[PDB]
Amino acid sequence: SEQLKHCNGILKELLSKKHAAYAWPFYKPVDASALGLHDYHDIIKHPMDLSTVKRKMENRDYRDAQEFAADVRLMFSNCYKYNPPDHDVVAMARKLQDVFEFRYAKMPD
Amino acid sequence: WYGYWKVPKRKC
Ligand SMILES: [N]
């Protein structure tokens, strides 16, 4: 579908060098043990990250654009839930989500 | 912003 091509384009942009300075914490699943975040999976019940969204897009797991958007926003919501708002990862999340939301709002009819 | 953490999640 046309809308899922738009989603795939957004995903390509989120993973591109253009945004790499702030997108990189979202490239792969949070490795809680490696980062010393031993409470992460007590707080975040449904982890999400861009490599998982990419795999689901490639396997045509998204029935529509709404399902894709729900995973992307889940990613950002997990970051806002786990991390205090003054932590740098939150400023990075907000910049990346600005990129996402403004382009997602251009979804072709 | 420089691609790594000085302190994970908290400090670039
Ligand atoms: N930092």
SSE blueprint and pairings:
The complex is a heterodimer of chains A (109) and B (12).
Chain A: H1 2-14, H2 20-23, H3 32-35, H4 40-43, H5 50-58, H6 65-82, H7 88-104
Chain B: no helix or strand
The complex binds amino group.
The site of amino group has 3 residues of chain B, from loops.
Describe the structure.
The complex is a heterodimer of chains A (109) and B (12). Chain A has helices at residues 2-14, 20-23, 32-35, 40-43, 50-58, 65-82, 88-104. Helices cover 63% and strands 0% of the residues of chain A. In chain A, helix 1 packs antiparallel against helix 5, helix 1 (2-14) runs antiparallel to helix 7 (88-104) and helix 6 runs antiparallel to helix 7. By secondary structure, chain A is mainly α. Chain A is built from 7 helices and no strands. Chain B is largely without helices or strands. Chains A and B meet through helix 2 and helix 7 of A and loops of B. Bound molecules: amino group. Amino group is lined by residues 6, 11-12 of chain B. The PDB classes it as transcription. Keywords: Bromodomain Cyclic peptides Acetyl-lysine, transcription. The assembly is dimeric.
